[PDB]
Amino acid sequence: KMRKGIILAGGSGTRLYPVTMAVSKQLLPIYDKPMIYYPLSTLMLAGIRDILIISTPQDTPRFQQLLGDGSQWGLNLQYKVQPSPDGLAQAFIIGEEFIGGDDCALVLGDNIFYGHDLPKLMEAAVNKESGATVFAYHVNDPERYGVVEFDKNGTAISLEEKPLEPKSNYAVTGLYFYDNDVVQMAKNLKPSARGELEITDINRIYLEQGRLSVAMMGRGYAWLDTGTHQSLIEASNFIATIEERQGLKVSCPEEIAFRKGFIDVEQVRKLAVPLIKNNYGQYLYKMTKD
Amino acid sequence: KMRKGIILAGGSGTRLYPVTMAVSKQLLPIYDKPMIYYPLSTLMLAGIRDILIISTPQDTPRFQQLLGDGSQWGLNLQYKVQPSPDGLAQAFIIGEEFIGGDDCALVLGDNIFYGHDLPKLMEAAVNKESGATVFAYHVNDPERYGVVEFDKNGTAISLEEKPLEPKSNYAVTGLYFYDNDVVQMAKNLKPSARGELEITDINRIYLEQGRLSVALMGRGYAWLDTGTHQSLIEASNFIATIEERQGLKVSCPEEIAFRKGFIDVEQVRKLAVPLIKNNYGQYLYKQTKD
Amino acid sequence: KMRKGIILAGGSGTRLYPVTMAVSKQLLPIYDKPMIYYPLSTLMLAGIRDILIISTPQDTPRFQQLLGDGSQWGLNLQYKVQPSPDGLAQAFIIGEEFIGGDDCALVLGDNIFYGHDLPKLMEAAVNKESGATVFAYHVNDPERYGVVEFDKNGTAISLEEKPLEPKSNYAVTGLYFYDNDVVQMAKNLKPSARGELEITDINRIYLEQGRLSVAMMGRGYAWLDTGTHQSLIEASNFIATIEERQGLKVSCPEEIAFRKGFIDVEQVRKLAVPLIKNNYGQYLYKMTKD
Amino acid sequence: KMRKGIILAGGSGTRLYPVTMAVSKQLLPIYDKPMIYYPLSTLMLAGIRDILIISTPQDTPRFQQLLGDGSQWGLNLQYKVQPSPDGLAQAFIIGEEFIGGDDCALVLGDNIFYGHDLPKLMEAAVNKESGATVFAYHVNDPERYGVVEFDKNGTAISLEEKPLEPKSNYAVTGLYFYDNDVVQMAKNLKPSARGELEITDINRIYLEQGRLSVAMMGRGYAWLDTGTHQSLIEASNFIATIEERQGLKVSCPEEIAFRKGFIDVEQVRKLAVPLIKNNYGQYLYKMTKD
Numbered sequence A, C, D: 001k002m003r004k005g006i007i008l009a010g011g012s013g014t015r016l017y018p019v020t021m022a023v024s025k026q027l028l029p030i031y032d033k034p035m036i037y038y039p040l041s042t043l044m045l046a047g048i049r050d051i052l053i054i055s056t057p058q059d060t061p062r063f064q065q066l067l068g069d070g071s072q073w074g075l076n077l078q079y080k081v082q083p084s085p086d087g088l089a090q091a092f093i094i095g096e097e098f099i100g101g102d103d104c105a106l107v108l109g110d111n112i113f114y115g116h117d118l119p120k121l122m123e124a125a126v127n128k129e130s131g132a133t134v135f136a137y138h139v140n141d142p143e144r145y146g147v148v149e150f151d152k153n154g155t156a157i158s159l160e161e162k163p164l165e166p167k168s169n170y171a172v173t174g175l176y177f178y179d180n181d182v183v184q185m186a187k188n189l190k191p192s193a194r195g196e197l198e199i200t201d202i203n204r205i206y207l208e209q210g211r212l213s214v215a216m217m218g219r220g221y222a223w224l225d226t227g228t229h230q231s232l233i234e235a236s237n238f239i240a241t242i243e244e245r246q247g248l249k250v251s252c253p254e255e256i257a258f259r260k261g262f263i264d265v266e267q268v269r270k271l272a273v274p275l276i277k278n279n280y281g282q283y284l285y286k287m288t289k290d
Numbered sequence B: 001k002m003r004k005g006i007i008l009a010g011g012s013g014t015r016l017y018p019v020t021m022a023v024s025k026q027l028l029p030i031y032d033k034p035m036i037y038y039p040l041s042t043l044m045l046a047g048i049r050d051i052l053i054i055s056t057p058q059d060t061p062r063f064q065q066l067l068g069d070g071s072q073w074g075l076n077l078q079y080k081v082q083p084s085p086d087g088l089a090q091a092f093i094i095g096e097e098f099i100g101g102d103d104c105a106l107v108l109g110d111n112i113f114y115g116h117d118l119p120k121l122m123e124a125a126v127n128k129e130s131g132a133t134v135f136a137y138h139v140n141d142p143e144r145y146g147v148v149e150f151d152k153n154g155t156a157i158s159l160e161e162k163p164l165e166p167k168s169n170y171a172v173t174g175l176y177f178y179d180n181d182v183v184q185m186a187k188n189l190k191p192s193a194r195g196e197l198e199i200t201d202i203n204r205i206y207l208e209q210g211r212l213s214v215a216l217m218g219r220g221y222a223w224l225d226t227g228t229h230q231s232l233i234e235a236s237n238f239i240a241t242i243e244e245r246q247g248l249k250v251s252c253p254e255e256i257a258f259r260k261g262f263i264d265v266e267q268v269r270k271l272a273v274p275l276i277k278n279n280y281g282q283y284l285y286k287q288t289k290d
């Protein structure tokens, strides 16, 4: 009944040491919220409310302390550990029992999107019956990502993970919608070129079958880079500038839950009261005025 | 009729002294281009090629040195002066002749909009045969702006200019679309207490007649503040973050002209060659290859 | 590791909620390292190698996992829990055994100091035989801090904690050096009207005995604000700007330990390798060559 | 009896196109003041009041319109055009008459310096009776600059302009103090490999004469980059961070003039008048009350 999604929020975070020896990348602040509120908000905006969060043995417990079972926000959250970061595709192997016979979305715990009409951008993917959908976004450094190449008619024709000679500048982002076939695909994958069970290898299987849709995410959207220390500071600054100008939050899960009807006002006021001593709780309380 | 454009780029710039003793506000850089490129970009995206720039007596020559007659970008730019900052609504008096019998789109020289489907956002406004269209955006400090009050059912019911007690948090942005009725409305206005001919008074008349459309600009759009030194730095950082991430420029008049067919590839390369030694020149040239 | 110092790294983290819901404020990044590296570097630059880290019941062990016993940096680190955030002066009661009969410096865990000749600005306070030294910095908002008032000759005459009517713009910063008498003073204190055991009350005692030295940190020093989410971004951007321009790190404990001779070249190399994927480890490795 | 200095503020500006198409680079804002205020403040801080500003044929008169003869600040400003940017040493040829038989300092118009005891560092160079003083600063990308090689005992042993294989990471900044011999040295210079009259060739002759002091500007100083659009934003954010924290301005000439006694209270209040309606004028006014 509730639609399903997985947030993959593990990984070593090597590239960010020594900051991530101290704290999981997906708990770092992006301005005024931990990084994982952002991909969580994306799933909620797609209308996905049953969500499995996968992290390392050390970090899962921290996420469980941050987010709980999710009922406070009208979600159902559950959790599993990935013993080692053996690839994004292991998400479906670990989450096979959670998924059952249902479709499932996957969002990476470091993926931040923002812009106008995000839900409508996702709508076709959410309602797809058969196949898979990913989103492409023009970047200046396609060699750091999965890269999708299109023909003159705009048909996707190839996908390559971190190519030395990228065939386009379109990166495949960290949000994926699959039908139920993904689970068996993942279970038959072999560790590839970089020694990982790769999501790109799943997507390539869908592409070879003619069932991968590639939704273009235009330049009016922001897909914020979380790859380096510098870009983490840029991401924060970006959110700060939007929020302080508007006096509205970006990816505040309480607010989304409220506006989408997952929780009612009585419940928003119950969340806000114990938090009214800080700016966040004051913002939540304001919601229930009008 | 056809729709002509006015960019109002006047004002003394006192809040920014001494920076604006040296350089007009609308020439200040927002990251990599002068501030006036951004509203000049909003007009082009709306399909407007015939544009009047109104500056102060002092600033006209520098805007002309920057933009010339516009022909390099398939535009036609003209210049008129505003002797003193007597109110936005003076633009229609100053431009009465350039406007003649046509519809008008006025944009303030310091207004910066960014977001997905911005041309669509303005589509209804451009295609409106009579009346006026304005844009409302939720801000944290509505007291600094024109403010539009809505009713329980979503209808604009009052407008107030920089009110001490705002009736809502929706500011009316500095982008306005009018039919041919406005020049006469402007000509019949009397100064407010503060001694300005107010654009808010014009909009109220249209509201009063049931002829004002108020299009909501969602939280997914960015409308960047340029009122303080601090917000300028934020505006620049915000644009930089986008452009460096995408490898694409925000509000590049040459690119928009080219993508909309105002100019052709042979004209783009002609523009690029003299500039080939700098980054801006190299971005132009590449756009002619792939 | 003869000389001693305490880093007070706990607190409720209320104002930063929800970022500090699952992470201590003092483990959050300031650009490319955890916040606590900064006050630790500060103590090291003063020549202090025996350091007690006090944090909350939940966070202390997290600091201990990250830093261990400090022998890898030539330091002696030990840890104590502060059961509740009942005031800075509690550091001396908690740290009573650690201190013993010795002088001791206290630095707050969220204090970031930068500027030419800081080690000299301090090295003196370290050499004072008796009494206490504090450092005063001109700020824009003195009401948020301990405030030191000076007479016409420049002699400190008054200290007040968070005064509604500040007598000066000089804030007393979170770096303090004390002789052995501070423990007894702290044991005799009673909470203030804020409900906290106040450092300002200890400083006032010394002031009245005529044994308080107030070092002025001029306008050439930076004492970075870490109060709000916004100020964390500001602090991170400031450090990033320095480091990226100079190709040198600010407050890197491995570098300071190597430069002051706490550890040797071999040791630095061994530390660098596990970090060598990014600039942080490469920077340490090259200090060994050049 | 006024000491003499030159601000070299010419050059193409091509790299910053289109931001420099209708605006001189050195009049662009660095946070709340035009760029040229910064080196101007630097010379003032050195106690130099008789200053020659050299720029392009197009920009020199813009500087003259902004600053006048400077006696409002207790300075004596004069102007000369550099027909083309044939090298920094040409400043001493164009400035020969202005120089006469006196010592002369040279600062680049886009260099920004900040740090504790900077005035003392410069007062030393100004106190020097014979020879020259330059300042060395560790940078990430030494190949862009004049580069100074040191002895194992840290004595400066060679200088190279933009070496392909830098011998150290110490760049020679754009602030130079010379005795009167510099004019004859410049006049004998021949164009370098870059076809320029190089300041590094002058410095090398003082160094080989044993008359060059190479003062180290340590890592607690900021020497800010102004060569890219991004470096401009970084320099603005760095200044805004210091100023907003301290409530004190960096390189405000009016403030410097007042504090060094070039002008008095009455004059300060006169300068405040045209600025009195924003924070900058208020800041000036308050210095004369507190």
Ligand SMILES: Cc1cn([C@H]2C[C@H](O)[C@@H](COP(=O)(O)OP(=O)(O)O[C@H]3O[C@H](CO)[C@@H](O)[C@H](O)[C@H]3O)O2)c(=O)[nH]c1=O
Pocket: A008, A009, A010, A011, A012, A025, A054, A055, A082, A084, A085, A086, A087, A088, A108, A109, A110, A144, A145, A146, A147, A161, A171, A172, A173, A174, A196, A199, A200
């Ligand atoms: C390998 C691995 C990763 N992760 C987490 C860590 C990160 O927060 C997040 C992304 O992992 P990364 O190692 O950065 O993979 P990454 O280089 O970011 O690339 C992935 O993400 C990209 C989009 O960001 C795509 O363009 C690539 O095709 C996709 O492979 O997933 C796990 O939770 N488990 C893992 O085993």
Ligand SMILES: Cc1cn([C@H]2C[C@H](O)[C@@H](COP(=O)(O)OP(=O)(O)O[C@H]3O[C@H](CO)[C@@H](O)[C@H](O)[C@H]3O)O2)c(=O)[nH]c1=O
Pocket: B008, B009, B010, B011, B012, B082, B084, B085, B086, B087, B088, B090, B108, B109, B110, B144, B145, B146, B147, B161, B162, B171, B172, B173, B174, B196, B198, B199, B200
């Ligand atoms: C009054 C005046 C302003 N300007 C320029 C200067 C600024 O770049 C910009 C706005 O200047 P302001 O001093 O805010 O103008 P002001 O009359 O007080 O306010 C207007 O500008 C605001 C912009 O959104 C609106 O929200 C208000 O509804 C509108 O009335 O337009 C002109 O070019 N000519 C002018 O006469």
Ligand SMILES: Cc1cn([C@H]2C[C@H](O)[C@@H](COP(=O)(O)OP(=O)(O)O[C@H]3O[C@H](CO)[C@@H](O)[C@H](O)[C@H]3O)O2)c(=O)[nH]c1=O
Pocket: C008, C009, C010, C011, C026, C054, C055, C082, C084, C085, C086, C087, C088, C108, C109, C110, C111, C144, C145, C146, C147, C161, C171, C172, C173, C174, C196, C199, C200
């Ligand atoms: C009260 C308290 C504080 N702390 C830690 C948390 C932060 O690292 C640091 C600062 O805590 P604060 O609650 O910000 O105390 P604060 O309002 O900043 O004021 C203190 O620090 C200021 C300088 O930052 C001084 O000017 C004040 O005189 C001094 O009282 O101390 C603890 O670890 N335990 C505590 O009980």
Ligand SMILES: Cc1cn([C@H]2C[C@H](O)[C@@H](COP(=O)(O)OP(=O)(O)O[C@H]3O[C@H](CO)[C@@H](O)[C@H](O)[C@H]3O)O2)c(=O)[nH]c1=O
Pocket: D008, D009, D010, D011, D012, D054, D055, D082, D084, D085, D086, D087, D088, D090, D108, D109, D110, D144, D145, D146, D147, D161, D171, D172, D173, D174, D196, D199, D200
């Ligand atoms: C050559 C030249 C430059 N300028 C202005 C343009 C720039 O704003 C500023 C510095 O110009 P650049 O062309 O970046 O400077 P460049 O000759 O490459 O390097 C100089 O400046 C560097 C410091 O920035 C030093 O490390 C070098 O040793 C010194 O030669 O001086 C002039 O006004 N006149 C000139 O002839």
Ligand SMILES: Cc1cn([C@H]2C[C@H](O)[C@@H](COP(=O)(O)OP(=O)(O)O)O2)c(=O)[nH]c1=O
Pocket: A217, A218, A219, A220, A221, B041, B045, B113, B114, B115, B116, B117, B118, B119, B249, B250, B251, B252, B255, B256, B259
């Ligand atoms: C096409 C184009 C858009 N824009 C800006 C205007 C809007 O803010 C935003 C619109 O992007 P978007 O609507 O997402 O792209 P698309 O129409 O290609 O699907 O980008 C430019 O700045 N330059 C351009 O060349």
Ligand SMILES: Cc1cn([C@H]2C[C@H](O)[C@@H](COP(=O)(O)OP(=O)(O)O)O2)c(=O)[nH]c1=O
Pocket: A045, A113, A114, A115, A116, A117, A118, A249, A250, A251, A252, A255, A256, A259, B217, B218, B219, B220, B221
């Ligand atoms: C509805 C909502 C959206 N968002 C974010 C998701 C998208 O990035 C963006 C959508 O804005 P937008 O589509 O422009 O809003 P609207 O429907 O009001 O016109 O805002 C939140 O952070 N919180 C919310 O409650």
Ligand SMILES: Cc1cn([C@H]2C[C@H](O)[C@@H](COP(=O)(O)OP(=O)(O)O)O2)c(=O)[nH]c1=O
Pocket: C041, C045, C113, C114, C115, C116, C117, C118, C119, C249, C250, C251, C252, C255, C256, C259, D217, D218, D219, D220, D221
């Ligand atoms: C020596 C050193 C100093 N610092 C900091 C302390 C001060 O805030 C700033 C300047 O210290 P400073 O001692 O004056 O400069 P220098 O070492 O070049 O002589 O640098 C570090 O962050 N790391 C270090 O390795």
Ligand SMILES: Cc1cn([C@H]2C[C@H](O)[C@@H](COP(=O)(O)OP(=O)(O)O)O2)c(=O)[nH]c1=O
Pocket: C217, C218, C219, C220, C221, D041, D045, D113, D114, D115, D116, D117, D118, D119, D249, D250, D251, D252, D255, D256, D259
């Ligand atoms: C006194 C003063 C200094 N400065 C700058 C020059 C140096 O970069 C920095 C520090 O100067 P410095 O004299 O060392 O600090 P202070 O007088 O407070 O001890 O401040 C100004 O910009 N304006 C001023 O009025």
